[PDB]
């Protein structure tokens with residue numbers, strides 16, 4: 016992997032359940048067999064959406080956790096593990112969606128203003144999820160839902176491996192900036208979603224709180240606003256994305272905009288831990304969407320990410336760390352394009368996120384953005400997962416491999432692997448002062464023959480006069496590799512004589528010794 020490391024020892028593979036309830040797809044008996052099969056192919060658990068629209072439909076505090084309980088019972092019967100997703104967002108309208116489960120309609124009546132929903136640059140109303148600015152309603156509603164869920168699902172503590180939270184549309188912490196109705200669907204630029212009267216009022220108050228008075232605001236922004244009412248979000252999204260973002264005003268607007276998501280992260284994290292820590296004592300996480308389009312557009316840099324709420328990934332991830340929430344990213348199966356008109360750079364995006372996450376000590380999980388139909392996509396996922404220290408990968412979605420033995424087989428081989436530490440020993444290495452030794456191999460877990468960025472480092476053993484290193488490898492998988500030398504200035508000088516291999520890597524920790 017990068018930084019001379021290897022694959023994460025804690026790596027697990029997960030499988031996304033269908034969006035619809037199991038009974039609308041197959042029977043519970045077959046489901047249990049499907050789980051045993053998934054397990055046999057390297058899957059550790061199944062992530063599943065438990066829709067708010069389903070759990071608190073009839074009214075405030077009128078709960079129904081019967082489906083969740085039945086699902087859990089079969090998971091238990093199959094000796095499997097599950098990862099509940101408290102989906103406080105609507106199913107339907109987003110890529111790959113096939114259901115229509117809006118959040119409880121009664122929630123919109125808890126306020127007579129427009130604080131609860133979203134409104135775009137052009138006036139498009141979005142009700143896929145509650146507006147994070149309304150923290151009072153969120154605190155109460157999410158808090159009550161989480162608590163009730165915990166009590167109803169306590170008996171299934173034993174099969175719950177982790178809990179996922181929904182920070183916004185399509186289960187991710189973000190604004191509904193890319194939608195068909197708002198004419199902002201892929202691969203168009205996104206539209207900011209801060210035009211309700213409540214949002215404008217909030218931005219205005221936040222700015223005045225920061226500078227004290229309008230005169231101080233003008234001085235800090237180098238502007239000449241005539242009144243406090245002139246303090247507003249961008250009136251022209253395109254112009255703001257072209258150059259407005261570069262100014263002090265632009266920096267402040269984006270700070271506030273992304274800041275709302277950061278605060279929301281800390282809020283749902285607090286509520287979740289309070290509700291689940293004692294009953295379950297399992298990790299909790301949230302998701303970040305992979306807004307890879309318009310990434311390198313020269314006219315509107317990161318023209319889709321910013322409107323989605325992503326301006327400073329480093330600052331955003333710090334919020335997750337503080338909230339004690341594991342992070343899940345996506346698009347691991349895609350490649351960089353960066354060409355007109357999409358200007359898509361998903362791989363570069365993934366690498367950046369992973370780098371930041373690892374630097375901050377944040378447990379990082381990944382997913383594929385779109386259904387995978389070929390092995391090549393699995394290899395791309397593998398490359399990212401095993402070279403960027405991902406602690407886990409979740410395959411979207413159930414049906415794709417459950418009803419495709421051939422594809423399921425490819426996944427088991429490339430991604431459904433169990434990490435196992437092994438000691439690698441290479442003797443008679445002709446190193447000189449300043450040289451370092453590394454190994455690189457065929458599989459993604461070995462950097463796929465990359466000597467520049469993904470090689471795994473070995474260490475000189477002065478006592479035995481050889482080079483050694485404890486490397487994490489895929490158990491029960493065949494591998495080929497070779498040790499090589501890098502000079503002080505990182506130039507590859509020479510390679511091991513014969514190509515080494517392990518057919519397959521042993522299930523139990525041991526050692527592989529070879530001669531240079």
Ligand SMILES: OC[C@H]1O[C@H](O[C@H]2[C@H](O)[C@@H](O)[C@@H](O[C@H]3[C@H](O)[C@@H](O)[C@@H](O[C@H]4[C@H](O)[C@@H](O)[C@@H](O[C@H]5[C@H](O)[C@@H](O)[C@H](O)O[C@@H]5CO)O[C@@H]4CO)O[C@@H]3CO)O[C@@H]2CO)[C@H](O)[C@@H](O)[C@@H]1O
Nearest residue numbers: 031064106109110111112185186201304305306345346384
């Ligand atoms: O069960 C969990 C969870 O599942 C769903 O949510 C998933 C999404 O399905 C995933 O895509 C992802 O959410 C993000 C993606 O990370 C992000 O990249 C983007 O998707 C982009 C695509 O990347 C882009 O290629 C483009 O898709 C095109 C295809 O290229 C084209 O071939 C096809 O014909 O049309 C599609 C759509 O135009 O555009 C999309 C954007 O629409 O955005 C998605 C959405 O946020 O991760 C989440 C979380 O796992 C369910 O929706 C959710 O309810 C559920 O909780």
Ligand SMILES: OC[C@H]1O[C@H](O[C@H]2[C@H](O)[C@@H](O)[C@@H](O[C@H]3[C@H](O)[C@@H](O)[C@@H](O[C@H]4[C@H](O)[C@@H](O)[C@@H](O)O[C@@H]4CO)O[C@@H]3CO)O[C@@H]2CO)[C@H](O)[C@@H](O)[C@@H]1O
Nearest residue numbers: 238240245246247248249250251254255258259260262264
């Ligand atoms: O809250 C204060 C004000 O905030 C908003 O105005 C912002 C814009 O959102 C930013 O994009 C930027 O504006 C730039 C503009 O992007 C750039 O093209 C250039 O503008 C010309 C404009 O093309 C022309 O039509 C005419 O208006 O003259 C402008 C000035 O030459 O310069 C703009 C300013 O540098 O910054 C402003 C704030 O400074 C929001 O839209 C306002 O309603 C709000 O009052």
Ligand SMILES: OC[C@H]1O[C@H](O[C@H]2[C@H](O)[C@@H](O)[C@@H](O[C@H]3[C@H](O)[C@@H](O)[C@@H](O)O[C@@H]3CO)O[C@@H]2CO)[C@H](O)[C@@H](O)[C@@H]1O
Nearest residue numbers: 455457463464465466495496497509510511512513514
């Ligand atoms: O990229 C696909 C490529 O993979 C295989 O080639 C790898 C070799 O198996 C591996 O040994 C290594 O090759 C180096 C030699 O070992 C070394 O002695 C010296 O000659 O430099 C070589 C170049 O790196 O790495 C390559 C991949 O870079 C497979 O055999 C190829 O057919 C295939 O195209």
Ligand SMILES: OC[C@H]1O[C@H](O[C@H]2[C@H](O)[C@@H](O)[C@@H](O)O[C@@H]2CO)[C@H](O)[C@@H](O)[C@@H]1O
Nearest residue numbers: 202203204312313314315355356357358
């Ligand atoms: O820099 C090229 C081009 O970028 C922008 O056009 C985008 C548009 O904003 C998106 O919504 C979508 O249609 O793709 C276009 C091509 O990238 C600018 O708006 C445009 O002026 C500029 O020429």
Ligand SMILES: [Ca+2]
Nearest residue numbers: 075076156159
């Ligand atoms: Ca409630």
